[PDB]
């Protein structure tokens, strides 16, 4: 498999040991933008602009 690359910004999650477990691309969809704005993987219920 092959896929192209580009300079993008991601939100990464580190566990207690130091291994990356979760990653979110902040330019994929609207949920990703909400998670990037809140800097969390489980944002609260609400209406965002």
């Amino acid at each position: 498999w092959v896929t192209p690359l580009s300079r993008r910004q991601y939100l990464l999650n580190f566990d207690e040991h130091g291994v990356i477990t979760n990653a979110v691309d902040c330019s994929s969809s609207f949920l990703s933008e909400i998670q990037c704005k809140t800097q969390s993987f489980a944002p609260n219920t609400g209406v965002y602009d």
Binding site: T45, G46, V47
Partner: protein
């Protein structure tokens, strides 16, 4: 530049027709930009003028030279989109305001969305049309009385109507059925208990410029001292806010204990029950056979769920130099100059004030009920609503049972999530968020080489580092000014709420004011006050009817001799071919007396004639 006729043949192109109705980028004879063109007939163009400017210096219209036509330029669309997202959903519901769905699916978005519909606010995506269904409360309010509800199953979101309040409907007539009116009168009643929380104080925060802008560097202080007294005003405003909070707390403490007189033979730990009413959950220590700390079970239950209390900040700041766990977000703020100071009065003496204020309404000389015992006081209060005294004097155990049941229900309701604890947590959450937002400003570059004084210092010479330090200084000063402005904006609402709390304590707890719809919801009887983290908790008791009965009444009669009578807080019923009097809140018939109605030397034609009432 970018306006003229001397073109360049370096990068040449081909002339194209001016398209209308599309957001395109133009290169018209030098002037560039993006917009939509529209053809319009104009007759205000001379031979020396070909472009139209606005009052601020913007191209709004122009005229072509090759076609001799006039066009008008309009800017393209640029706006945001609302996204309603639930707790653990997979895709939020989208809402484009003031835009129809026939415009966003072919000019803005190109994704095949199988769910889309127009509304009064605009276009909604990933939702269904369920306007015909109402809802009491919502968490995602859009506007104009519309809400979005998440239902676990198409689209899990539902676009419904928001109706927070209704009106009670009673199936009765409105017209006069033979000169009488059909009204519902209660038959069986009870005592209900409500609770509310009013914020009084605010956390006292102190900031120091000697550690926020310049931590310990001398070259930073040399540039900070050039501005002058720009940092003294911050400390002055903080001290003024702290003094205002202290004065407010002292005024509240004075309003709590004002005229209270208690007996010296009460410190026995046994005088806690009167009229078979349990008040152990409201009273604490009163005397000398206790320790330093003393609260009530309700106050303890309220404080056990709030960690950032008065003693919480002290216990957190104490664990900063030990070595157990210094990774908390409290010591890092104290190491930079932001410190929370405790108030003058502690949460223990205010508990004693509330306990004394509660006892003042239980035992002689009854300094909180004008010298009237508690059962007689509550009986007079419930009689003032328009009930008979006989049913009150005959049923005294039911009143105490209802009081005990309401108190137990209020005590048990704290296990759930009410609005009082919600606000008590929200205030401290907002305070913590403000502190974190103020602390995060120390890691911003503010248009410099690095967001750190050491990296700027040990990378260049002072002549090239002065500007880099000045940028950070200006940024941090602006942040401090914004924080001071926010604190000054919040202290006003804090003081207003505290004044309202003082007024409610003075006119609802210590005294029984005749102001209706002030201490309760029209049927208010009494209220009690307790302490709570950063505020007071008011427990009100109200008169709640249970059963009802329809009855025909008449608002006054006409006696014999051109004289009229009118009821006082009641009605006239016709029972057993005779006119009797009933209360406005109970259905105990009683004969008409002198001290029950009001007389008048003339009666109108609307009153019902009854010349057989010889009760003079």
């Amino acid at each position: 530049i970018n306006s003229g006729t001397t073109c360049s043949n370096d990068l040449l192109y081909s002339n194209t027709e001016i398209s209308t109705g599309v957001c395109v980028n133009y290169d018209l004879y030098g002037i560039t930009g993006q917009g939509i063109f529209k053809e319009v007939s104009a007759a205000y163009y001379n031979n020396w003028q070909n472009l139209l400017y606005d009052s601020n210096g913007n191209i709004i219209g122009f005229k072509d030279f090759l076609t001799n036509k006039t066009y008008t330029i309009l800017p393209c669309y640029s706006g945001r989109v609302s996204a309603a997202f639930y707790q653990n959903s997979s895709s939020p519901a989208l809402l484009y305001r003031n835009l129809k769905c026939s415009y966003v699916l072919n000019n803005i978005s190109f994704i095949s969305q199988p769910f889309y519909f127009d509304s009064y606010l605009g276009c909604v995506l990933n939702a269904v049309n369920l306007t015909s269904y109402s809802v009491s409360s919502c968490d995602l309010r859009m506007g104009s009385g519309f809400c979005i509800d998440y239902a676990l199953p198409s689209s899990p979101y539902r676009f419904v109507t928001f109706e927070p309040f209704n009106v009670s409907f009673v199936n009765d007539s409105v017209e006069t059925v033979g000169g009488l009116f059909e009204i519902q009168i209660p038959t069986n009643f009870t005592i209900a208990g409500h609770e509310e929380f009013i914020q009084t104080s605010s956390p006292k925060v102190t900031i120091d410029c000697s550690a926020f802008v310049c931590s310990n560097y001398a070259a930073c202080h040399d540039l900070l001292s050039e501005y002058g007294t720009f940092c003294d005003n911050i400390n002055s405003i903080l001290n003024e806010v702290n003094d205002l909070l202290d004065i407010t707390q002292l005024q509240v403490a004075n309003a709590l204990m004002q005229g209270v007189t208690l007996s010296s033979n009460l410190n026995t730990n046994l005088h806690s029950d009167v009229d078979n009413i349990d008040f152990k959950s409201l009273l604490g220590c009163l005397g000398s056979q206790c320790g330093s700390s003393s609260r009530s079970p309700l106050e303890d239950l309220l404080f056990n769920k709030v960690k950032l209390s008065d003693v919480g900040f002290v216990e957190a700041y104490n664990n900063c130099t030990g070595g157990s766990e210094i990774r908390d977000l409290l010591c890092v703020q104290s190491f930079n100059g932001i410190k929370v100071l405790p108030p003058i009065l502690s949460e223990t003496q205010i508990s004693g004030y509330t306990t004394a204020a509660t006892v003042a309404a239980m035992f002689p000389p009854w300094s909180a009920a004008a010298g009237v015992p508690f059962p007689l006081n509550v009986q007079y209060r419930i009689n003032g609503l328009g009930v008979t005294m006989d049913v009150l004097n005959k049923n005294q155990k039911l009143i105490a049972n209802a009081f005990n049941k309401a108190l137990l229900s209020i005590q048990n309701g704290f296990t759930a999530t009410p609005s009082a604890l919600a606000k008590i947590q929200s205030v401290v959450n907002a305070n913590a968020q403000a502190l974190n937002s103020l602390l995060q400003q120390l890691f911003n570059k503010f248009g410099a080489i690095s967001s750190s004084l050491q990296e700027i210092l040990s990378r260049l010479d002072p002549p090239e580092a002065q500007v880099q330090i000045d940028r950070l200084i200006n940024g941090r000063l602006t942040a401090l000014n914004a924080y001071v402005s926010q604190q000054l904006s919040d202290i006003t609402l804090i003081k207003a709420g505290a004044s309202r709390a003082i007024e409610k304590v003075n006119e609802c707890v210590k005294s029984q004011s005749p102001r209706i719809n002030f201490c309760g919801n029209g049927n208010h009887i009494l209220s009690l006050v307790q302490n709570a983290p950063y505020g007071l908790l008011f427990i009100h008791f109200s008169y709640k009817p249970t059963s009802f009965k329809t009855v025909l009444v008449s608002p006054g009669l006409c006696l014999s001799g051109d004289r009229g009578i009118a009821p006082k807080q009641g009605y006239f019923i016709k029972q057993n071919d005779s006119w009797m009097f009933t209360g406005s809140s109970y259905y105990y018939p009683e004969p008409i007396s002198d001290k029950n109605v009001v007389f008048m030397n003339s009666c109108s034609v609307n009153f019902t004639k009854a010349p057989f009432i010889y009760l003079n």
